Write a protein that binds this ligand. Structure first.
Ligand SMILES: NC(=O)C1=CN([C@@H]2O[C@H](COP(=O)(O)OP(=O)(O)OC[C@H]3O[C@@H](n4cnc5c(N)ncnc54)[C@H](OP(=O)(O)O)[C@@H]3O)[C@@H](O)[C@H]2O)C=CC1
Ligand SMILES: NC(=O)C1=CN([C@@H]2O[C@H](COP(=O)(O)OP(=O)(O)OC[C@H]3O[C@@H](n4cnc5c(N)ncnc54)[C@H](OP(=O)(O)O)[C@@H]3O)[C@@H](O)[C@H]2O)C=CC1
Ligand SMILES: COc1cc([C@@H](C#Cc2c(C)nc(N)nc2N)OC)cc(OC)c1OC
Ligand SMILES: COc1cc([C@@H](C#Cc2c(C)nc(N)nc2N)OC)cc(OC)c1OC
Lengths: 165, 165
């Protein structure tokens, strides 16, 4: 019924860890560069907790915050309270990026068309996970090794998957 | 319609610069060794400006120069005036390397099957750029850090991507 591409944008470790103590368990500025370039010009859909840890709108993109709080407001951002309200806000968009965290990934899981996953080859301590997905009917359409150096101290790969049917 | 693999061979910086003042912005003799070893035994397809800065045929490869000039001739080199004429000349080749510069990379962009791209981790001043490419349905099949030493004073990586669909 919705006409936008619904894409997930996530970085996770060997055990699907995405967070520890309401923050990111790793610092990978080069991974952040990839995220910025990939998502630029497209709406970012984020759970309230994800957004609040950021604390400011990310420039050049529609920032849409998902919350059950019907009195929630933040300047420079739009607020939605359900999947359908996100779909109404983004009805004429080409592609939107579900940007996390875990509760918001779970929420949009039935609707994902395309997956941009950074896979980090380390096992971090963590408490928040990317949902399991059955990847049948999914095709890897891109893979490349991430930049590992003094500023980016882990091995990681960018993967992109597209849903077939 | 054509049966040869159409490969690109290019070195570019962090902003896709490949040239400044009709020359290469950097000196990387080790990168040139990789170029020789990779292309040897296969046709090099070069724009007229690229070739003329070289000024002589590169040994052990068919040198094919692309120009609109129907009276253009160079000893030890073959001359083509269109994509189709290159395809005619190379119809029985296994693989050909589009060798630049930017106008010639633009020209053959719809036909590229394989990308050999060196990425230099520096921002040079430049005036000539490698075209943007949507890497959907391409996979990185090779990556290696280039040699950085007194003779090769930048950080760079060899990447090879192959088109899937
Ligand atoms: N590595 C990565 O790729 C990413 C990791 N993260 C990490 O994930 C963690 C945060 O994730 P998590 O704790 O799951 O929180 P989320 O970011 O998913 O936000 C949860 C909030 O979203 C709102 N929400 C959840 N479900 C609904 C619903 N059905 N309808 C309306 N609103 C809803 C609620 O807001 P409210 O309480 O206001 O009602 C809820 O508290 C952090 O550790 C963060 O660092 C985040 C993004 C990416
Ligand atoms: N870093 C790298 O990997 C490389 C960098 N370079 C750099 O690129 C620069 C040169 O590139 P650029 O200036 O774009 O020039 P090119 O090497 O692409 O050559 C331009 C010439 O190609 C011919 N040409 C262009 N389009 C067509 C067409 N449609 N049909 C027939 N002939 C055509 C024309 O020749 P004519 O005028 O005779 O008609 C034109 O002048 C230099 O700085 C060089 O150092 C070059 C190769 C590799
Ligand atoms: C944009 O900058 C940030 C983003 C996030 C967000 C995310 C993400 C995110 C990342 C990093 N990588 C991928 N592949 N997908 C994602 N969805 O939550 C961790 C938190 C930040 O610090 C609080 C950020 O710094 C300002
Ligand atoms: C081979 O020797 C040369 C080649 C080129 C060519 C190129 C290239 C080229 C390079 C360097 N690296 C990669 N990865 N791809 C390419 N296509 O144009 C700049 C110019 C030269 O001097 C002006 C060369 O010295 C004789």
């Amino acid at each position: 019924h919705h006409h936008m591409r619904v894409s997930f944008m996530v970085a996770m470790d060997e055990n699907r860890v995405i967070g520890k103590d309401n923050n990111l368990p790793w610092r990978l500025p080069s991974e952040l560069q990839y995220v910025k370039k990939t998502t630029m010009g497209h709406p970012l859909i984020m759970g309230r907790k994800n957004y609040e840890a950021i604390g400011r709108p990310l420039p050049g993109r529609r920032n849409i915050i998902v919350t059950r709080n019907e009195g929630y407001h933040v300047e420079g951002c739009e607020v939605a309270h359900s999947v359908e309200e996100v779909f109404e806000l983004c009805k004429n968009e080409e592609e939107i990026f579900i940007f996390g965290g875990a509760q918001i990934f779970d929420l949009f899981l039935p609707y994902v068309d395309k997956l941009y996953i950074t896979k980090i080859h380390h096992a971090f301590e963590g408490d928040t996970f990317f949902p399991e997905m059955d990847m049948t009917n999914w095709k890897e359409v891109f893979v490349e090794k991430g930049l590992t150096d003094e500023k980016n101290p882990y091995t990681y790969y960018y993967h992109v998957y597209e849903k077939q049917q």
